Amino acid sequence: SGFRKMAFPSGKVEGCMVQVTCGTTTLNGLWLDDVVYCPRHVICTSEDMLNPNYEDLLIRKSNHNFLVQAGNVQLRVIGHSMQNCVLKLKVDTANPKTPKYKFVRIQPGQTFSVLACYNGSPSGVYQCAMRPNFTIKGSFLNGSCGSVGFNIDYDCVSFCYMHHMELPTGVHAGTDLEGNFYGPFVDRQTAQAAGTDTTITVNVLAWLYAAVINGDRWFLNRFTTTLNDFNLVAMKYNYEPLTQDHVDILGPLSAQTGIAVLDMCASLKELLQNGMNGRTILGSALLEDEFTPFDVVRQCSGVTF
Amino acid sequence: SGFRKMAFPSGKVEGCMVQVTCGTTTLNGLWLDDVVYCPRHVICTSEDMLNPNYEDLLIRKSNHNFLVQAGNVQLRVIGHSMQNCVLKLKVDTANPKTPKYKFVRIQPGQTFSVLACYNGSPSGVYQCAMRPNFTIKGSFLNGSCGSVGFNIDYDCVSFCYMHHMELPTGVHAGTDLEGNFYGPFVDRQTAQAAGTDTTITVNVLAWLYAAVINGDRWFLNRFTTTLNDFNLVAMKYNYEPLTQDHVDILGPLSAQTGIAVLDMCASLKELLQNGMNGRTILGSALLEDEFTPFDVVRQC
Numbered sequence: 001s002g003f004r005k006m007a008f009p010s011g012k013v014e015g016c017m018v019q020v021t022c023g024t025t026t027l028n029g030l031w032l033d034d035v036v037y038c039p040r041h042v043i044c045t046s047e048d049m050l051n052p053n054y055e056d057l058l059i060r061k062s063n064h065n066f067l068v069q070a071g072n073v074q075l076r077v078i079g080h081s082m083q084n085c086v087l088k089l090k091v092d093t094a095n096p097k098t099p100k101y102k103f104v105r106i107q108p109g110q111t112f113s114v115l116a117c118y119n120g121s122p123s124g125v126y127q128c129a130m131r132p133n134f135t136i137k138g139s140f141l142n143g144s145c146g147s148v149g150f151n152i153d154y155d156c157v158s159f160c161y162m163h164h165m166e167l168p169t170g171v172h173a174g175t176d177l178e179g180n181f182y183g184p185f186v187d188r189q190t191a192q193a194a195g196t197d198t199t200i201t202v203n204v205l206a207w208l209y210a211a212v213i214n215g216d217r218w219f220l221n222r223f224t225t226t227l228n229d230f231n232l233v234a235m236k237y238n239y240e241p242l243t244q245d246h247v248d249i250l251g252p253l254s255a256q257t258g259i260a261v262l263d264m265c266a267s268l269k270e271l272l273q274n275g276m277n278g279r280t281i282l283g284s285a286l287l288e289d290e291f292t293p294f295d296v297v298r299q300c301s302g303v304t305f
Numbered sequence: 306s307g308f309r310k311m312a313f314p315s316g317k318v319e320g321c322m323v324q325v326t327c328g329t330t331t332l333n334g335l336w337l338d339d340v341v342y343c344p345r346h347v348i349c350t351s352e353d354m355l356n357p358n359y360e361d362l363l364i365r366k367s368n369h370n371f372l373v374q375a376g377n378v379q380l381r382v383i384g385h386s387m388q389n390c391v392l393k394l395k396v397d398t399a400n401p402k403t404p405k406y407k408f409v410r411i412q413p414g415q416t417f418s419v420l421a422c423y424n425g426s427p428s429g430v431y432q433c434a435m436r437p438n439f440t441i442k443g444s445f446l447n448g449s450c451g452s453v454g455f456n457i458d459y460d461c462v463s464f465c466y467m468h469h470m471e472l473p474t475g476v477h478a479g480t481d482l483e484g485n486f487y488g489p490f491v492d493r494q495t496a497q498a499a500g501t502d503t504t505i506t507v508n509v510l511a512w513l514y515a516a517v518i519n520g521d522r523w524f525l526n527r528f529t530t531t532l533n534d535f536n537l538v539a540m541k542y543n544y545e546p547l548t549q550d551h552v553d554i555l556g557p558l559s560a561q562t563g564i565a566v567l568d569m570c571a572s573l574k575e576l577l578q579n580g581m582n583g584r585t586i587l588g589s590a591l592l593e594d595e596f597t598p599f600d601v602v603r604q605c
């Protein structure tokens with residue numbers, strides 16, 4: 001019993017974190033095999049950030065301009081190249097702690113664990129979701145750039161996020177490990193704002209199933225709804241549309257609890273139109289949308305890594 | 306910016322998790338140096354769980370009755386002893402992954418990270434607080450016993466909790482790493498109930514300071530309060546009394562934000578009276594009490 005916002009065990013990722021310094025800027029790097037990945041903005045001064053020409057800034061750098069520190073050992077940089085918004089520093093040593101890994105680009109609503117780092121040292125781990133507006137509501141300070149997001153699928157770490165910046169609203173933006181930004185953001189010190197966010201409907205339903213599994217049923221009702229009527233209500237409340245794929249994905253949770261997906265949608269519609277009436281669900285007075293259906297199944301069944 | 310429930314990176318603890326089997330029972334163990342720590346109830350059968358006599362059950366076991374598996378390697382048990390409710394299995398190999406560590410017994414309101422495990426394998430990491438009623442609101446299933454709670458301030462892991470059982474309300478009870486239970490609980494399947502839980506007042510104040518540090522001030526007011534008047538009000542909402550120790554602990558956060566502790570207490574009194582009126586504080590519609598003053602300073 002119990003339901004917590006749970007991150008993946010971070011050990012496999014901790015063994016990959018290094019410190020990258022270029023001039024006065026120090027941030028985090030991810031060392032996998034003989035390459036260290038980090039935000040390309042490590043090469044910028046404050047003035048360069050206003051309007052950087054990264055190819056021009058990079059051509060002026062030599063290998064010895066990048067200091068990479070893994071623990072208390074300095075790694076030798078023997079090459080450097082840029083892929084989109086990520087800098088790749090070739091090092092003379094393959095990371096002996098390199099886990100089985102892959103780089104995956106996730107979709108909005110998908111969750112992942114973030115290993116927040118400063119100076120190449122992991123400080124904390126938290127679970128979060130890629131918002132529909134492509135930001136993450138992370139917890140990051142200056143020096144956290146290069147911190148990564150990941151999932152574990154069996155014994156393989158799938159790296160999906162690298163931290164680059166904080167927007168004026170306090171939310172965060174970054175890229176996949178191929179350097180492609182999530183969202184309409186650019187790596188430049190310039191006026192940028194996140195689009196209006198929406199709630200991840202399939203995740204709220206997953207969390208309502210988790211609440212039922214944990215003995216919280218007050219919100220259930222005798223009603224059902226069509227997918228189209230539910231989507232009309234979802235649009236009204238700034239909830240993401242629910243597709244048939246979402247319903248299919250909620251199939252196992254629906255079969256385990258005996259609450260059809262459209263039956264749970266009728267509970268969600270009533271919750272949206274009426275509120276919770278002073279009550280809570282899993283210790284929350286708001287509808288939680290940062291647990292996917294897979295996260296709920298994983299936590300309620302004790303899957304290990 | 307941002308404020309999350311943040312756990313410590315679990316790597317240092319993952320390298321210590323092992324599987325311990327005694328007969329038909331399998332649970333988790335914590336392998337540090339040449340000793341594996343685990344709940345002593347691993348030696349119980351179904352028939353032993355209401356009134357086990359652990360000294361009697363343990364005297365009947367030989368070293369080879371305990372199977373310890375670290376990854377895909379079986380560790381040889383060369384000794385065994387019981388310390389309170391923890392069993393200590395001496396093994397023939399020191400854990401090469403043993404981090405710098407210590408055992409610390411925590412007080413209610415203290416937070417820690419839990420590395421939930423099954424069959425010696427880590428499943429997930431989350432953040433917990435030791436409730437005022439000495440239980441923890443964890444996420445644990447059958448097989449999670451022996452999973453541990455810890456803090457890693459600097460590079461030293463301070464182990465503070467070892468999971469032993471789930472009470473009928475769904476909350477969890479366990480011991481420190483010296484085997485002493487937190488709370489009035491016993492490792493027996495006899496009827497046990499947690500005392501009425503209360504909100505950790507000092508932690509709610511810490512989190513209100515975190516909200517101010519992160520730019521939110523809507524809940525502030527022009528009022529102050531005496532410590533005694535605050536406690537008289539707060540107790541009516543099942544909040545823990547705020548002591549002068551707590552007021553002192555909030556000193557740095559008070560000095561950083563410019564809001565006196567009793568001034569923040571008046572905000573809390575008003576929030577308890579009015580609720581949030583459709584507003585949120587750090588993305589929450591309820592008052593959060595699982596961040597300590599130390600956690601707020603570390604994260605913000």
Ligand SMILES: Cc1ccncc1NC(=O)Cc1cc(Cl)cc(O[C@H]2CC(=O)N2)c1
Pocket residue numbers: 041140141142143144145164165166167168172186187188189190191192193306
């Ligand atoms: C200080 C901090 C805190 C947390 N996480 C990260 C950081 N660091 C930064 O944001 C530094 C930075 C890097 C880039 Cl590529 C762009 C940038 O300005 C953009 C952000 C916006 O809206 N204009 C600023």
Ligand SMILES: Cc1ccncc1NC(=O)Cc1cc(Cl)cc(O[C@H]2CC(=O)N2)c1
Pocket residue numbers: 001346445446447448449450469470471472473477491492493494495496497498
């Ligand atoms: C099933 C489960 C789920 C999560 N975490 C742990 C578990 N396992 C247990 O609770 C097993 C267990 C061990 C002990 Cl030492 C005592 C016990 O019964 C006490 C609890 C109560 O009210 N009487 C029960």
Ligand SMILES: [Cl-]
Pocket residue numbers: 271272275276285286287
């Ligand atoms: Cl609501």
